[PDB]
Nucleic acid binder design. Structure first.
Lengths: 129, 150, 123, 205, 80, 82
RNA sequence: UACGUCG
RNA sequence: UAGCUAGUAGGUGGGGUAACGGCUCACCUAGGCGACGAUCCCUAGCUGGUCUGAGAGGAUGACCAGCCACACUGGAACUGA
RNA sequence: CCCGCAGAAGAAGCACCGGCUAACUCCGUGCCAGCAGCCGCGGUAAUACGGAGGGUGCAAGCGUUAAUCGGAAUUACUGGGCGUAAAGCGCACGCAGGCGGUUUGUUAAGUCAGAUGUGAAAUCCCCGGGCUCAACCUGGGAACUGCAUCUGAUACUGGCAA
């Protein structure tokens, strides 16, 4: 059954980048809009738009720089089978800083740079490389 | 400024009608010493003809690598056929410390001081092919910032 | 492989037991050499290989190869077994230390001299 | 614990002048350099990758007169120090007392300098140091004692000090026969042809 | 304040005493998975008010029998 | 009895004594409550040779601790400053 | 056996 | 090696100890432990650490130091803080 | 520890040289004698056996053996696999277990941040100091990745209510 909708979202974006898809729709939630706002903020997607009233639908307009795709490798880190909670010192950098890692901290859903600057660790959701 | 070096020569066989027939395969890598790495295979009936076909194929089919100061940028994993290969920039982690047939491509590639560890198969014809794939899909901070805006 | 399956039952690599039950895993043992033989090797090789059969000090009766050209062993001749397989003979797992208790050094030898129990010739 | 053999043989296996007989005359002229390191020395080796790494380590040890456990300890110390392990390793080999006595022109070779150091003819900072591998700190004064001053050797050695290149990190002064190790030698200040990445990679396998 | 624990009654049938299962939720040292893990405790109660299936807080005291170094403070959540 | 006493720790023919506070029936180089200074009888003729925390020593003598003859000699050496 | 190249 | 346990699990009262306590005894209740591995069997002193490892780990716990246990073998108490 | 005396005078072995693996020829032997960690050498011109010359590596040591970890991603948590190489239960139902769509409120158990107590000393690491240097000894720090308590944060997971 669906047991990890975040990894489902990242799957939608990997398979949309891999199929030269212009835009990606999915069911929407607060955590997916938080992550999507981080992705737009860090420049991996072009835009997002949440529509619907009783059944919201998140839509990510994807990016393609050259013919190549911008989101090179998006991975889900803290899956439901095994959750991964890092401190502010253990908090990893991806592609030696060239690629953010979306961590859910108590202050909100941030990146690794932003939460290492904020001085607080948390639950590391996904590597975007 | 061409900086060519051969990795592996082998004797392959064919098994015709009357006995066997033995041929020699070279496998070389050239590179200028600042990106610009190529490999060539080349096979012939004697060894110097084999290495010459290998060099001649390797001088063309040469790929750009986005080096750092003297080394890689981020840790990169390249795979080819059965041969999985890790590399780590080792920001002046002195000396090229790579496996056989990876030391050579990293040596003429112009990188100086990375850390490697090939996994899986370590056939020399596929461990390069897994270093270039690898160094090819390693991108620089002016390319990532080009992609994602800033 | 699933992490739950490893919590239920962890990984376990086997013990990889010893080639040489020289017991306690001692570097040498001593034995009495119950008899002395020559034995024909396995198929691609042919020779007569000089091999003793030894009652060790820990009870085990094991057969043992005798290195070098020519020995002086006969049936009681307390020797010092060493450890090391001769692959060409089926079932010898040990060697005798030449230049040890009742096993003289190899006669007229000049190179690789330490591993055959021979002293340095005075010159 | 030191070599004690044919020296120019060691300089002939490496293919390069290792400065092992600096002495009176000029460039070798009786070495048959390059030609025959043994009986089959006329053969080109077609040397391996292990052979080039090994042969680089042997070049450096046979220059500075160090054996393997001591060299290996220098590699461990150069590894743990902050910076560049090749350059740190040459900085550890250049701070050796017998080397600093050689660089100042007090000995003709490094073995003669090692015998000056060994035979209590050398003080550092006004204290006699008997040890070939004493590690000379920067801003030190290393000199010859009153015994073994104005002995022939050192005079002749200073005579052949002017034929060489006068190292930048020293105060060579031969009037008083005292020297000042001022700073650690930069990598660009020494020898230019040894490949220390080969010996880093040799010990890192 | 005092250090106390919470747990549920696992069985009831003993003469002015009870036994309480505690659920600590601990990460596996090798595998990094948060795993439930119990701790059954023989707990004292004067006049045995708590029955089976309850939830009760519990503090540590002097020994009162063999094992039994624990005594309740507050019975909550008895709902059947 | 707790004793402020020396405990030999240097090499052979080169002792370095660490002054500790031990239960007196322990071994010399054994179990101590706290170490409180040191005493090097050589060290060189440089700067110290001996430093020794007088506040903690005064604490333990306030508790009832005894002091061996060397530690008393060292406190009589480092009196307040010298 | 057996594959190692110049004015 | 899937069942183990009758002072066994708990209670009341008496005794006992420097001190709580089935520690012990009388009576009452019929519990307690166990697949989160009891019980049985083989092995083993434990730790700070040591060796190896890029690391995570793996092996080990000689010297040095902390704790426990033993003092020919089995048992017992006496003196004493 | 310092000074003086006499004289190079008292002071170099061990393994290896077919590939892996740095370092090659001659002679003796001829499926023998024997070598060997694996591949495998030896049945007449053996760079693999035994000797010599030569060389290579280490050096008051050097080899062999035993044992551990590494290499071994060949138990894979980091970090593997399962159509045909070993590997998908013959197929289902289902308890305990693991996991669980979406919104709001509360809690704050997990999680995170800070503080305090502790995590003995030595050892490892860093910056210094003393033995002529080094090993060694030593000063200060870092570390001991932990546990407990208190103070907070509430995004995610859990509890509770809708």
């Amino acid at each position: 059954s669906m047991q990890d909708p975040i990894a489902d979202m990242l799957t939608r974006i990997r398979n949309g980048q891999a199929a030269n898809k212009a835009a990606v729709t999915m069911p929407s939630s607060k955590l997916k809009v938080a992550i999507a706002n981080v992705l737009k903020e860090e420049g991996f997607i072009e835009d997002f738009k949440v529509e619907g009233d009783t059944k919201p639908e998140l839509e990510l307009t994807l990016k393609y720089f050259q013919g190549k795709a911008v989101v090179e490798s998006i991975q889900r880190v803290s899956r439901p089978g095994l959750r991964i909670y890092k401190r502010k010192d253990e908090l990893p950098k991806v592609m030696a800083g060239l690629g953010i890692a979306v961590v859910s901290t108590s202050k909100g859903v941030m990146t690794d740079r932003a939460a290492r600057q904020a001085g607080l660790g948390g639950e590391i959701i996904c590597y975007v490389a | 400024e061409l900086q060519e070096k051969l990795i592996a020569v082998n004797r392959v066989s064919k098994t015709v009608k009357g006995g066997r027939i033995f041929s020699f395969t070279a496998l070389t890598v050239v590179g200028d010493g600042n990106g610009r790495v190529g490999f060539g295979y080349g096979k012939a009936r004697e060894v110097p003809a084999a290495i010459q076909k290998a060099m001649e194929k390797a001088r063309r089919n040469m790929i750009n690598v986005a080096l750092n100061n003297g080394t890689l940028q981020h840790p990169v994993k390249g795979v080819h056929t059965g041969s999985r290969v890790f590399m780590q920039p080792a920001s002046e982690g002195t000396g090229i410390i790579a496996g056989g047939a990876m030391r050579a491509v990293l040596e003429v590639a112009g990188v100086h001081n990375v850390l490697a560890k090939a996994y899986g198969s370590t056939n020399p014809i596929n461990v390069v092919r897994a270093t270039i794939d690898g160094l090819e899909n390693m991108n620089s901070p002016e390319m990532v910032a080009a992609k994602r805006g800033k | 492989a699933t992490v739950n399956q490893l919590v239920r039952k962890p990984r376990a690599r086997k013990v990889a037991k010893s080639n040489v039950p020289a017991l306690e895993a001692c570097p040498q043992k001593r034995g009495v050499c119950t008899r002395v033989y020559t034995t024909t090797p396995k198929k691609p090789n042919s020779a007569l290989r000089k091999v003793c059969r030894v009652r060790l000090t820990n009870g085990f009766e094991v057969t043992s190869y005798i290195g070098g050209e020519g020995h002086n062993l006969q049936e009681h001749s307390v020797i010092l077994i060493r450890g090391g397989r001769v692959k060409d003979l089926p079932g010898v797992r040990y060697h005798t230390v030449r230049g040890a208790l009742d096993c003289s050094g190899v006669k007229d030898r000049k190179q690789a001299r330490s591993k055959y129990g021979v002293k340095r010739p005075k010159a | 614990a030191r070599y004690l053999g044919p020296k120019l043989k060691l300089s002939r296996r490496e293919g390069t002048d290792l400065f092992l007989k600096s002495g009176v005359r000029a460039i070798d002229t009786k070495c048959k350099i390059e030609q025959a390191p043994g009986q089959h020395g006329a053969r080109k080796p077609r040397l391996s990758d292990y052979g080039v790494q090994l042969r680089e380590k042997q070049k450096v040890r046979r220059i500075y007169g160090v054996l393997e456990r001591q060299f290996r300890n220098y590699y461990k110390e150069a590894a743990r120090l902050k910076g560049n392990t090749g350059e740190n390793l040459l900085a550890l080999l250049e701070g050796r007392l017998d080397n600093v006595v050689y660089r100042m022109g007090f000995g003709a070779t490094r073995a003669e300098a090692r015998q000056l150091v060994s035979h209590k003819a050398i003080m550092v900072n006004g204290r006699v140091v008997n040890i070939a591998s004493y590690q000379v700190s920067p801003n030190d004064v290393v000199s010859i004692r009153e015994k073994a001053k104005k002995q022939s050797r050192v005079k002749a050695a200073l005579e052949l000090a002017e034929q060489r290149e006068k190292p930048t990190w020293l105060e060579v002064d031969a009037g008083k026969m005292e020297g000042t190790f001022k700073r650690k030698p930069e990598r660009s200040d020494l020898s230019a042809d040894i490949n220390e990445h080969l010996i880093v990679e040799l010990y890192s396998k | 304040k005092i250090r106390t624990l919470q747990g549920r009654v696992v069985s009831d049938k003993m003469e002015k005493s009870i036994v309480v299962a505690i659920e600590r939720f601990v990460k596996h040292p090798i595998y990094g998975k948060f795993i439930k893990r119990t701790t059954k405790l023989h707990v004292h109660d004067e006049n045995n008010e708590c029955g089976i299936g309850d939830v009760v807080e519990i503090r540590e005291c002097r020994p009162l029998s063999k094992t039994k170094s624990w005594t309740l403070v507050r019975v909550v959540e008895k709902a059947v | 009895m707790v004793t402020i006493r020396l405990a030999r720790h240097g090499a052979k023919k080169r002792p370095f004594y660490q002054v500790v506070v031990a239960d007196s029936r322990n071994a010399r180089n054994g179990r101590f409550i706290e170490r409180v200074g040191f005493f090097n009888p050589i060290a060189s003729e440089k700067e110290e040779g001996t430093r020794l925390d007088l506040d903690r020593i005064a604490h333990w003598v306030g508790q009832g601790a005894t002091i061996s003859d060397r530690v008393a000699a060292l406190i009589k050496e480092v009196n307040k400053a010298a």
